[PDB]
Amino acid sequence: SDPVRQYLHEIGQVPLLTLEEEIDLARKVEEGMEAIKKLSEATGLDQELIREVVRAKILGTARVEEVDGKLKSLPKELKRYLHIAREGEAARQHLIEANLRLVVSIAKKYTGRGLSFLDLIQEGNQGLIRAVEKFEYKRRFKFSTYATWWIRQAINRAIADQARTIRIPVHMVETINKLSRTARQLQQELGREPSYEEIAEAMGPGWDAKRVEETLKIAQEPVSLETPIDFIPDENLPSPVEAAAQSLLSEELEKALSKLSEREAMVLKLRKGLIDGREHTLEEVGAYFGVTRERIRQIENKALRKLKYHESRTRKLRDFLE
Amino acid sequence: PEWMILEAVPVLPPDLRPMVQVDGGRFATSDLNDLYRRLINRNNRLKKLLAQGAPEIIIRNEKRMLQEAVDAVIDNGRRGSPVTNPGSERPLRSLTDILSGKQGRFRQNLLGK
């Protein structure tokens, strides 16, 4: 029922190609970008503008026109190039339409790994778009199953690019398939699920145990199934009681700092950075506060004691746990 | 009639939940995201799969993906989008049976506080 049947109907409704109609149409592409290359270097359109901006026009079943302008003012050496490129504009006309059906019957394999049959076509089908193109019309093997690669190889590059995984360069899939096929390899030839280090030998250089474990620790298709059974609780982000035990310690210090002298209280504030958040050095504290470090350094320690001494005789040694 | 759509709008916070141990299992992940993805990927593959001139047939068959891909974050009410694909299983928490639905979030945080 999947919407694929809808596409499966539009796809398998139009016939493919005869046999000689495959090449005849293709050659139009060559001289297409070529005859278009005429105007390309002619005014400096990099041969990609005249084509891309026109292929849009070629797709006159939808947008623009534009460029033609100068392409009609055609000098005495032009008018033939007008039709040539417009006869070549037919190169992007029929081709590409057949294969759509020829491919699909291939995606029926990767019906698993990742992406449903329907998404795999997007990748698989799009590979044809690139592969159709770089076809060596020269060779005498004629287009067909030779495109299957571009497709499938674009499919492997697809399933790799897309999976319920985070990021998978061929650095892990090709390696996990290894330890996997290897673990499954030693398996049938042992009888028990081999350990991790035991696989080390199966592999080789650098393949100890830690690394063999780092791989099957990242992913393959785990990363949980997501939500069975708000399947999981926990917490501690902006702790409630904590954010409450905060204002205390602060306001508590404000009180514990009441029995202090400005030539020490503020000295501490700025110093340890309590005022706002500026942990000013002892120099900044010495500048503003005239007198050079000497008596200041003493005032520094003059504190601590006068700040700890007032503790053992009056608790507050519990604020440390938070 | 701005009901036609051109910019779905999913948040991100709710998901970035990470490792849960004890008793007998750990590893950790979320849903709505892997559900979300469906979208962007498509809406991304569309553009780059057209600019390179993908004539007719193809074009629609794709594009529409977005459409279907949109009936994602929204409401899974048709054929389903099970996880574990192929996966003959569970239902993607798509605001259906959960979030907005009944007894999942709405029927839950209204009184089930």
Short mmCIF file of C-alpha atoms in Angstrom, two decimals:
data_model
loop_
_atom_site.label_atom_id
_atom_site.label_comp_id
_atom_site.label_asym_id
_atom_site.label_seq_id
_atom_site.Cartn_x
_atom_site.Cartn_y
_atom_site.Cartn_z
CA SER A 1 0.00 0.00 0.00
CA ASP A 2 3.00 2.25 0.65
CA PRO A 3 3.02 5.36 -1.58
CA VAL A 4 5.63 3.40 -3.52
CA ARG A 5 2.88 1.63 -5.46
CA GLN A 6 1.84 5.09 -6.67
CA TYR A 7 5.39 5.66 -7.93
CA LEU A 8 5.66 2.00 -8.92
CA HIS A 9 2.79 2.71 -11.31
CA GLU A 10 4.13 5.93 -12.82
CA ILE A 11 7.56 4.32 -13.09
CA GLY A 12 6.50 1.10 -14.80
CA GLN A 13 4.07 2.79 -17.17
CA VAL A 14 6.53 4.39 -19.58
CA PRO A 15 8.73 2.12 -21.76
CA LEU A 16 12.54 2.16 -21.59
CA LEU A 17 14.57 2.51 -24.79
CA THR A 18 15.08 0.50 -27.97
CA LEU A 19 18.84 -0.03 -28.29
CA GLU A 20 20.26 2.40 -30.84
CA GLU A 21 18.18 5.17 -29.27
CA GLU A 22 20.46 4.99 -26.24
CA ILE A 23 23.57 6.38 -27.94
CA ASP A 24 22.05 8.65 -30.59
CA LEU A 25 20.45 10.72 -27.83
CA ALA A 26 23.57 10.70 -25.65
CA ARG A 27 25.88 12.26 -28.26
CA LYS A 28 23.65 15.33 -28.04
CA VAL A 29 24.94 15.91 -24.51
CA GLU A 30 28.58 15.97 -25.60
CA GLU A 31 28.11 18.59 -28.32
CA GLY A 32 25.50 19.97 -25.94
CA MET A 33 27.91 21.31 -23.33
CA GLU A 34 30.39 21.76 -26.18
CA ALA A 35 28.22 23.84 -28.52
CA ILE A 36 27.12 25.60 -25.34
CA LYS A 37 30.81 25.91 -24.48
CA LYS A 38 31.01 27.99 -27.66
CA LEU A 39 29.10 30.77 -25.93
CA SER A 40 30.74 29.73 -22.65
CA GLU A 41 34.24 31.06 -23.30
CA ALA A 42 32.62 33.43 -25.80
CA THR A 43 31.47 35.71 -22.98
CA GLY A 44 32.87 33.78 -20.00
CA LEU A 45 29.88 31.79 -18.77
CA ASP A 46 32.12 28.96 -17.57
CA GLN A 47 30.09 26.58 -19.79
CA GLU A 48 28.01 25.79 -16.70
CA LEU A 49 25.82 28.89 -16.77
CA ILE A 50 24.48 28.59 -20.32
CA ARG A 51 23.62 24.96 -19.59
CA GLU A 52 22.31 25.08 -16.01
CA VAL A 53 20.39 28.31 -16.61
CA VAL A 54 19.01 26.76 -19.80
CA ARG A 55 18.46 23.19 -18.62
CA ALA A 56 15.95 25.08 -16.47
CA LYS A 57 14.50 26.42 -19.71
CA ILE A 58 14.85 22.97 -21.24
CA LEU A 59 12.51 22.11 -18.37
CA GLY A 60 10.17 24.61 -19.94
CA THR A 61 7.56 22.52 -18.20
CA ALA A 62 8.14 24.67 -15.26
CA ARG A 63 10.30 27.86 -14.96
CA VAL A 64 12.55 30.53 -16.60
CA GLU A 65 13.75 31.58 -20.12
CA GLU A 66 16.07 34.62 -19.82
CA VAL A 67 19.52 33.96 -21.49
CA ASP A 68 18.21 33.52 -25.00
CA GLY A 69 18.45 37.26 -25.48
CA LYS A 70 22.04 37.46 -26.67
CA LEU A 71 21.72 33.97 -28.14
CA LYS A 72 19.45 35.39 -30.84
CA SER A 73 21.34 38.56 -31.74
CA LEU A 74 23.55 35.89 -33.33
CA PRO A 75 26.26 37.44 -35.52
CA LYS A 76 26.99 36.47 -39.14
CA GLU A 77 28.88 33.50 -37.68
CA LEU A 78 25.84 32.50 -35.64
CA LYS A 79 22.31 31.11 -36.12
CA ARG A 80 23.56 27.59 -36.66
CA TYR A 81 24.78 27.59 -33.06
CA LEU A 82 21.27 28.70 -32.08
CA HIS A 83 19.66 25.50 -33.34
CA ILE A 84 22.61 23.24 -32.48
CA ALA A 85 22.31 24.04 -28.78
CA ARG A 86 18.51 23.89 -29.05
CA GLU A 87 18.79 20.55 -30.85
CA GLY A 88 21.23 19.58 -28.14
CA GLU A 89 18.86 20.93 -25.50
CA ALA A 90 16.94 17.81 -26.47
CA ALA A 91 19.80 15.81 -24.95
CA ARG A 92 18.33 16.40 -21.51
CA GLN A 93 14.92 15.46 -22.94
CA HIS A 94 14.26 11.72 -23.12
CA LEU A 95 17.19 10.06 -21.35
CA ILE A 96 16.92 9.59 -17.57
CA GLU A 97 13.25 8.63 -17.96
CA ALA A 98 13.84 4.92 -18.69
CA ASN A 99 16.24 3.80 -15.95
CA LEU A 100 13.89 4.84 -13.15
CA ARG A 101 12.27 1.43 -13.62
CA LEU A 102 15.52 -0.41 -14.39
CA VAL A 103 16.97 0.56 -11.00
CA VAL A 104 14.31 -0.02 -8.30
CA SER A 105 14.52 -3.80 -8.82
CA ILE A 106 17.96 -3.37 -7.22
CA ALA A 107 16.97 -1.60 -4.00
CA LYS A 108 15.04 -4.75 -3.10
CA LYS A 109 18.29 -5.92 -1.50
CA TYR A 110 19.11 -3.19 1.02
CA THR A 111 15.62 -3.74 2.42
CA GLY A 112 17.02 -3.62 5.93
CA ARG A 113 20.23 -1.93 7.12
CA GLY A 114 18.66 1.52 7.11
CA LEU A 115 16.03 3.56 5.28
CA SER A 116 12.81 1.97 4.03
CA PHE A 117 12.45 0.75 0.43
CA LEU A 118 10.79 4.09 -0.35
CA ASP A 119 13.88 6.34 0.85
CA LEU A 120 16.43 4.06 -0.71
CA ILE A 121 15.04 4.91 -4.11
CA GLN A 122 15.90 8.56 -3.52
CA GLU A 123 19.53 7.67 -3.05
CA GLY A 124 19.63 4.80 -5.50
CA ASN A 125 17.68 6.69 -8.17
CA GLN A 126 19.67 9.88 -7.75
CA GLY A 127 22.92 7.93 -8.41
CA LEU A 128 21.67 7.28 -11.82
CA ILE A 129 21.37 11.03 -12.34
CA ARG A 130 25.10 11.52 -11.89
CA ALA A 131 26.14 8.12 -13.49
CA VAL A 132 23.97 8.66 -16.54
CA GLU A 133 25.91 11.44 -17.27
CA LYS A 134 29.56 10.39 -17.09
CA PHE A 135 28.86 7.61 -19.58
CA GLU A 136 31.76 6.78 -21.90
CA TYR A 137 29.71 6.73 -25.11
CA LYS A 138 32.93 5.55 -26.76
CA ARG A 139 33.08 1.99 -25.42
CA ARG A 140 31.17 -0.77 -27.19
CA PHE A 141 29.46 -2.28 -24.16
CA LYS A 142 26.29 -0.19 -24.31
CA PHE A 143 24.64 1.30 -21.24
CA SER A 144 22.71 -1.09 -18.96
CA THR A 145 23.84 -3.16 -15.97
CA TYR A 146 26.98 -1.00 -16.01
CA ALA A 147 24.93 1.68 -14.25
CA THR A 148 23.92 -0.68 -11.45
CA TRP A 149 27.25 0.05 -9.75
CA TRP A 150 26.90 3.84 -9.68
CA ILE A 151 23.48 3.16 -8.19
CA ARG A 152 24.36 0.55 -5.58
CA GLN A 153 27.68 2.25 -4.81
CA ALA A 154 25.70 5.44 -4.25
CA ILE A 155 23.35 3.34 -2.13
CA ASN A 156 26.16 2.10 0.11
CA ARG A 157 27.33 5.71 0.36
CA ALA A 158 23.72 6.45 1.31
CA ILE A 159 23.10 3.81 3.97
CA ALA A 160 26.44 4.91 5.41
CA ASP A 161 25.51 8.58 5.33
CA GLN A 162 22.10 7.74 6.77
CA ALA A 163 21.32 5.37 9.62
CA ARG A 164 19.97 5.73 13.15
CA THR A 165 23.61 6.46 13.90
CA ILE A 166 25.34 9.77 14.60
CA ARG A 167 28.20 9.89 12.08
CA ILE A 168 29.57 6.86 10.28
CA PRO A 169 32.60 7.24 8.02
CA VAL A 170 33.52 3.93 6.36
CA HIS A 171 35.86 3.85 9.38
CA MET A 172 33.44 1.84 11.52
CA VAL A 173 30.78 0.17 9.38
CA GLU A 174 33.44 -1.58 7.30
CA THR A 175 35.20 -2.43 10.57
CA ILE A 176 32.16 -3.41 12.62
CA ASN A 177 31.07 -5.65 9.75
CA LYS A 178 34.54 -7.11 10.28
CA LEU A 179 34.48 -7.91 14.01
CA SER A 180 30.86 -8.90 13.35
CA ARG A 181 31.57 -11.30 10.49
CA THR A 182 34.72 -12.22 12.42
CA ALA A 183 32.91 -12.93 15.68
CA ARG A 184 30.45 -14.85 13.52
CA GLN A 185 33.50 -16.33 11.79
CA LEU A 186 35.22 -17.63 14.92
CA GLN A 187 31.76 -18.58 16.18
CA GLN A 188 30.97 -21.45 13.80
CA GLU A 189 34.58 -22.53 14.33
CA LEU A 190 34.59 -22.70 18.12
CA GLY A 191 31.12 -23.15 19.60
CA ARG A 192 30.93 -20.23 22.02
CA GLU A 193 30.62 -16.45 21.73
CA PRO A 194 34.32 -15.47 21.59
CA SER A 195 35.53 -12.75 23.95
CA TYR A 196 36.86 -9.36 22.86
CA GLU A 197 40.60 -9.91 23.31
CA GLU A 198 40.16 -13.32 21.70
CA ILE A 199 39.17 -11.46 18.53
CA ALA A 200 42.36 -9.39 18.67
CA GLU A 201 44.34 -12.18 17.02
CA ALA A 202 41.58 -12.71 14.45
CA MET A 203 42.28 -9.12 13.43
CA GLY A 204 45.89 -7.97 13.65
CA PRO A 205 48.22 -4.94 14.09
CA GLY A 206 47.11 -2.58 16.85
CA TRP A 207 43.94 -4.63 17.21
CA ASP A 208 44.25 -5.39 20.92
CA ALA A 209 41.07 -5.47 23.00
CA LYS A 210 40.45 -1.90 24.14
CA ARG A 211 40.01 -0.70 20.56
CA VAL A 212 37.92 -3.74 19.60
CA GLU A 213 35.72 -2.62 22.48
CA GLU A 214 35.73 1.10 21.66
CA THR A 215 34.15 0.35 18.29
CA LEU A 216 31.23 -1.82 19.41
CA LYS A 217 30.75 0.82 22.12
CA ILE A 218 29.88 3.66 19.77
CA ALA A 219 27.10 2.20 17.63
CA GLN A 220 25.85 -0.11 14.86
CA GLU A 221 22.15 0.31 15.60
CA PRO A 222 21.84 0.50 19.42
CA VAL A 223 21.57 4.02 20.85
CA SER A 224 18.48 2.57 22.55
CA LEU A 225 15.12 2.28 20.81
CA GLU A 226 14.43 5.68 22.36
CA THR A 227 11.17 5.54 24.32
CA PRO A 228 9.65 2.27 25.65
CA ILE A 229 8.78 1.48 29.30
CA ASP A 230 9.26 8.85 29.66
CA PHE A 231 10.84 5.40 29.76
CA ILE A 232 13.54 6.60 32.16
CA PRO A 233 13.69 9.18 35.03
CA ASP A 234 16.78 10.52 36.86
CA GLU A 235 17.77 14.19 37.29
CA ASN A 236 20.08 16.78 38.88
CA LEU A 237 20.22 19.58 36.29
CA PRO A 238 19.25 22.73 38.21
CA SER A 239 18.92 20.97 41.58
CA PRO A 240 16.05 22.56 43.59
CA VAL A 241 17.40 22.31 47.14
CA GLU A 242 20.83 23.29 45.78
CA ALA A 243 19.77 26.59 44.20
CA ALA A 244 18.23 27.23 47.62
CA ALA A 245 21.33 26.33 49.62
CA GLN A 246 23.10 28.84 47.38
CA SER A 247 21.48 32.11 48.46
CA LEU A 248 22.09 30.92 52.02
CA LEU A 249 25.87 30.49 51.89
CA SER A 250 26.01 33.89 50.18
CA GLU A 251 23.67 35.75 52.53
CA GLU A 252 25.35 33.72 55.27
CA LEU A 253 28.75 35.12 54.34
CA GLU A 254 27.28 38.62 54.22
CA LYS A 255 26.57 37.99 57.90
CA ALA A 256 29.84 36.15 58.53
CA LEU A 257 31.48 39.20 56.96
CA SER A 258 29.63 41.61 59.25
CA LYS A 259 32.30 41.23 61.93
CA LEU A 260 34.96 42.34 59.44
CA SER A 261 36.84 45.53 58.59
CA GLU A 262 36.59 47.21 55.19
CA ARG A 263 40.38 47.16 55.03
CA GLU A 264 39.98 43.38 54.99
CA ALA A 265 36.42 42.58 53.95
CA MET A 266 36.65 44.42 50.64
CA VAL A 267 40.25 43.25 50.46
CA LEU A 268 38.88 39.70 50.46
CA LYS A 269 35.92 40.46 48.18
CA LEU A 270 38.00 41.74 45.27
CA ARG A 271 40.82 39.30 46.03
CA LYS A 272 39.09 35.90 45.89
CA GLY A 273 36.63 37.59 43.55
CA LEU A 274 33.42 37.88 45.55
CA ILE A 275 32.38 41.46 44.77
CA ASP A 276 31.09 40.60 41.30
CA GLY A 277 33.40 38.02 39.79
CA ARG A 278 36.65 39.90 39.22
CA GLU A 279 39.44 37.93 40.88
CA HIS A 280 41.63 41.04 40.86
CA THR A 281 45.27 40.29 41.66
CA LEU A 282 46.93 41.60 44.82
CA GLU A 283 48.31 44.48 42.76
CA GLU A 284 44.92 45.89 41.78
CA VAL A 285 44.01 45.55 45.46
CA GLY A 286 47.21 47.36 46.37
CA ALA A 287 46.86 50.16 43.85
CA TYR A 288 43.38 51.44 44.73
CA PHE A 289 44.08 50.53 48.34
CA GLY A 290 47.14 52.76 48.40
CA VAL A 291 49.62 51.05 50.71
CA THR A 292 51.92 48.53 49.06
CA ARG A 293 51.43 44.77 49.55
CA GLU A 294 53.41 44.74 52.81
CA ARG A 295 50.70 45.58 55.36
CA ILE A 296 48.24 44.23 52.80
CA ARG A 297 49.71 40.71 52.69
CA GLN A 298 49.42 40.73 56.46
CA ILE A 299 45.83 41.95 56.20
CA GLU A 300 45.31 39.02 53.83
CA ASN A 301 46.27 36.40 56.41
CA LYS A 302 45.00 38.83 59.04
CA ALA A 303 41.69 37.68 57.60
CA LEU A 304 41.68 33.87 57.28
CA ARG A 305 42.48 33.43 60.97
CA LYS A 306 40.03 36.18 61.97
CA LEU A 307 37.71 34.27 59.65
CA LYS A 308 38.44 30.69 60.72
CA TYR A 309 38.99 31.55 64.37
CA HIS A 310 35.39 32.77 64.40
CA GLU A 311 34.28 29.34 63.18
CA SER A 312 35.33 26.55 65.55
CA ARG A 313 33.61 28.64 68.22
CA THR A 314 30.53 29.08 66.03
CA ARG A 315 29.65 26.38 63.49
CA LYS A 316 29.33 27.02 59.75
CA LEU A 317 31.69 24.24 58.67
CA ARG A 318 28.74 22.55 56.96
CA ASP A 319 28.35 24.96 54.04
CA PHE A 320 31.27 23.14 52.41
CA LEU A 321 29.01 20.29 51.29
CA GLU A 322 27.38 21.94 48.26
CA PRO B 1 -5.20 29.78 4.46
CA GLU B 2 -1.52 29.62 5.34
CA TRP B 3 -2.35 25.98 6.10
CA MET B 4 -0.18 25.03 3.13
CA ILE B 5 3.26 24.47 4.62
CA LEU B 6 6.75 25.79 3.98
CA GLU B 7 8.55 25.63 7.34
CA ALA B 8 7.82 22.93 9.93
CA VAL B 9 9.22 24.01 13.28
CA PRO B 10 10.61 21.42 15.76
CA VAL B 11 12.37 22.34 19.02
CA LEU B 12 15.38 20.40 20.36
CA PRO B 13 15.58 20.43 24.18
CA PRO B 14 13.51 17.43 25.19
CA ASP B 15 15.92 14.74 23.75
CA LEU B 16 19.61 15.01 24.69
CA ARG B 17 19.24 12.43 27.42
CA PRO B 18 22.26 10.17 28.06
CA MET B 19 23.57 7.01 29.85
CA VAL B 20 21.24 5.04 32.46
CA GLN B 21 22.90 2.17 34.62
CA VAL B 22 21.92 -0.19 37.35
CA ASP B 23 20.44 -3.57 38.10
CA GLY B 24 21.24 -5.54 34.94
CA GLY B 25 21.25 -2.77 31.72
CA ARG B 26 22.68 0.97 30.59
CA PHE B 27 22.82 2.85 27.06
CA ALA B 28 20.65 6.03 26.25
CA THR B 29 18.60 7.73 23.41
CA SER B 30 15.31 9.71 22.54
CA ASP B 31 12.47 9.78 20.01
CA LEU B 32 10.79 12.51 17.97
CA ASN B 33 14.27 13.31 16.79
CA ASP B 34 15.09 10.15 14.86
CA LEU B 35 11.47 10.75 13.98
CA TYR B 36 12.23 14.34 13.11
CA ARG B 37 15.28 13.51 10.96
CA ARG B 38 13.03 11.81 8.44
CA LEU B 39 12.21 15.33 7.44
CA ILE B 40 15.32 17.50 6.97
CA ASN B 41 17.13 14.61 5.30
CA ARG B 42 14.46 14.52 2.62
CA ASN B 43 13.93 18.27 2.37
CA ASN B 44 17.70 18.35 2.04
CA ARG B 45 18.03 15.57 -0.53
CA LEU B 46 15.28 17.15 -2.57
CA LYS B 47 17.03 20.43 -3.45
CA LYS B 48 20.38 18.83 -4.30
CA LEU B 49 18.41 16.21 -6.21
CA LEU B 50 16.77 18.55 -8.69
CA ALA B 51 19.39 21.22 -9.11
CA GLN B 52 21.24 18.45 -10.88
CA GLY B 53 18.34 18.27 -13.30
CA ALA B 54 16.13 15.36 -12.23
CA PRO B 55 13.40 15.46 -14.88
CA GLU B 56 9.74 14.77 -14.07
CA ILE B 57 8.59 11.46 -12.51
CA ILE B 58 11.43 11.47 -10.08
CA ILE B 59 10.90 15.06 -8.88
CA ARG B 60 7.36 14.59 -7.54
CA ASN B 61 7.87 11.06 -6.20
CA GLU B 62 10.60 12.70 -4.14
CA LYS B 63 9.38 16.13 -3.03
CA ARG B 64 6.24 14.48 -1.82
CA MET B 65 8.58 12.70 0.54
CA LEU B 66 8.69 15.91 2.51
CA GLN B 67 4.88 15.83 2.56
CA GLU B 68 4.77 12.31 3.91
CA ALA B 69 7.90 13.16 5.92
CA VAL B 70 5.83 15.93 7.45
CA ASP B 71 2.99 13.69 8.56
CA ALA B 72 5.78 12.63 10.89
CA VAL B 73 6.35 14.91 13.86
CA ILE B 74 2.64 15.43 13.40
CA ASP B 75 0.39 12.32 13.56
CA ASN B 76 1.34 8.77 12.62
CA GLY B 77 -2.11 7.86 11.35
CA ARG B 78 -2.03 5.78 8.19
CA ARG B 79 0.49 2.98 7.56
CA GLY B 80 2.94 3.68 10.38
CA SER B 81 6.68 4.39 10.67
CA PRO B 82 8.01 1.70 13.05
CA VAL B 83 11.54 1.93 14.40
CA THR B 84 13.84 -1.07 13.77
CA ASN B 85 12.96 -0.82 10.05
CA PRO B 86 12.07 -3.11 8.46
CA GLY B 87 10.90 -3.50 12.09
CA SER B 88 7.41 -4.94 12.52
CA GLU B 89 6.89 -3.11 15.80
CA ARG B 90 6.21 -0.07 18.01
CA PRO B 91 4.72 3.34 16.97
CA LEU B 92 6.90 6.46 16.59
CA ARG B 93 5.82 8.85 19.33
CA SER B 94 4.37 11.34 16.83
CA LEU B 95 2.04 13.39 19.08
CA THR B 96 -0.24 10.33 18.73
CA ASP B 97 -1.01 8.08 21.73
CA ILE B 98 1.53 10.46 23.34
CA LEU B 99 2.19 14.22 23.59
CA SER B 100 -1.09 16.02 23.10
CA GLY B 101 -2.80 12.64 22.86
CA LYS B 102 -4.62 11.02 25.78
CA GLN B 103 -2.92 9.82 28.96
CA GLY B 104 0.57 10.50 27.66
CA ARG B 105 1.38 14.13 28.35
CA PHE B 106 -1.84 16.07 28.13
CA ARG B 107 -4.04 13.74 30.20
CA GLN B 108 -0.91 13.44 32.31
CA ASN B 109 0.21 17.02 33.05
CA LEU B 110 -3.14 18.68 33.54
CA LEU B 111 -3.97 16.78 36.71
CA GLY B 112 -1.60 13.80 36.83
CA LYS B 113 0.92 16.16 38.44
#
